[PDB]
Curated annotation (Swiss-Prot):
Region described as Methionine-rich region: spans on this chain: 327-357
GO molecular function (one): copper ion binding
Effect of M327L: Almost loss of oxidase activity with 2,6-DMP as substrate. Loss of the copper tolerance phenotype
Assigned EC number: 1.16.3.4
Applications (biotechnology): Triggering CueO activity at need by the addition of copper salts with minor toxic effects on E.coli cells could be used as a simple tool for biosynthetic purposes. The protein was also identified as robust host protein for use in biosensing and drug-screening applications.
Species whose genome carries this gene: Escherichia coli (strain K12)
Temperature dependence: Optimum temperature is 55 degrees Celsius with 2,6-DMP as substrate.
Protein known as: Multicopper oxidase CueO
Amino acid sequence: AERPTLPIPDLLTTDARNRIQLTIGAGQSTFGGKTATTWGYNGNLLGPAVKLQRGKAVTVDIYNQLTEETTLHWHGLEVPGEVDGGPQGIIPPGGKRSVTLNVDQPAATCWFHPHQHGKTGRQVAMGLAGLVVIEDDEILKLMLPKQWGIDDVPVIVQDKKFSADGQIDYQLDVMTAAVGWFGDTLLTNGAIYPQHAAPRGWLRLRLLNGCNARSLNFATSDNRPLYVIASDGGLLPEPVKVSELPVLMGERFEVLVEVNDNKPFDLVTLPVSQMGMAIAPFDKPHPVMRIQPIAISASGALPDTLSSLPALPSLEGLTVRKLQLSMDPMLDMMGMQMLMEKYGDQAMAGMHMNHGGKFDFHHANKINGQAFDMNKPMFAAAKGQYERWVISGVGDMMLHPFHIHGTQFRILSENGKPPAAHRAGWKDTVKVEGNVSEVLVKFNHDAPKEHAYMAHCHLLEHEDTGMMLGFTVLQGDHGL
C-alpha cells in the first residue's frame, strides 16, 4: 500500500590504492509489477555517486560486462579529451578501461552516462547514468545539508515507456529523431513515485534531468519556494528563490527546500511547452516524490552568500565560433506529422519508400551543414583562452539543449535573452530553441584528434542522428 522509499545511490570514494571500480552490466528491474531488462553501473539500473575532491587525482577502473561497446562521459568535468569519454572512448564488451581524473574545478554535482556513437539515447534509456559529487574546501565551510541520503539527496528524474511484455520500448526512428524519445512513466532514482523521509529544517535536493528528450519544470505541491544554490558547474554567488525551476536534459541544479513537521508535500514537475511532452499524464502537474517530514532537527544552513562569481570577461577581441544547428526540413516535418497523427492536438498543447542513403534520418540532423563526423573534428579551439561560441537554432522550432564537453562556461545570451539569475553562473548546457545563444567558454585541458571533445544537442536522439561536432584543444594563440 505504501510508496517505496527514494533509492539512495551509494556515495563511492577511493580505497588506499586510489581506485573506484565501476561495472557496466545488464540486469533486471521491476516496474508496475512487470520485469524489464535494464542496465546499470554497480547494479541493475542507474549507478553510484562518485565522490571527488578538488586538487586530487583518482583512477577509475571501468569494466564493460555488456555484450556491446559503450563509452563513459563525465558530464560536466573539466578533464582532458583522453578521459572525457566521448564516442572515441570505446570500451570493448568484456573489456576494461582505466581513466585518471585530475580534479581541478569548484564543488559541483556533475554526472556520467554513455556516449556511444549513434547509440547514446538507447544506452541512457536502458538505464545507464550515475552521479559525480565534487567537493572542495570552500563548500564544506558553508555548513550546507550534508547527510547523504537523509538531508542531502540526489533526485535523478527520467521518463520511460514500456511495451506490453514489460520491456523498455526504445526506438530511434523518423519520429524520435525529430521530437525525441519520451514516455508515460516517470522514474525518480529508478522508482515510481517514491517517498523520502527528511528531518525538520533544510532539505538539499540535487536535481538531475536524466530524460532523453523531456524537459522538466520542478515545483512544490503546496507552493513552498525552492532556494537554488547551485547549477551544473557549482554554487551560485547567493541563493536564488524560485517558485518553479525549468531543467533541460542533462542539467543539474541543487535546491534547498524547507521541511516542517506534520506537512507532507510533493516535489512535482509542471507541464512544459515542448512538442510531445504535455500528453497525459504530463498535461497536468506530475508527482516526482513525496517528502515526508520527520520530527528530528536537521542541522544544515542556507547561507546569505555561497561563492564568489567572477565578472564576465570583456568581449573585445575574443575568437567567435558559429555553430548553426539544423534539421533536414523534410524529415523534421515527417517526424512532427507522425507525432500529430499518433497523439493529435495534445502533441502541441501549450506551444513512404526507400530513396537511398541521401534521405536517411540517421544523418538528418547537423551542425554547420554537416552530420557528425568522428573522423574529422571541425575546429581546433584555443587552450586557456576565453572564446565566444554562438549557437543558433534559427530554422526550426525544436528544443536543443546544447552541451559542450571539457568546460564549465558562462551564458551571455540564452536563446535571445540574458540568462535568469540562477542560470548566470557555471553551466555546461544552454537552451537553444528557435533563436540564438552565446556562451563564454574556456578549455583548460587538451583534447587531440584521437580523443576530441564533443559539442552537441543533448536531446539524445538529435545527437545520435548527427547534431554533434568534434573539436580539439592543443594550445593557445602563438600569434603576435
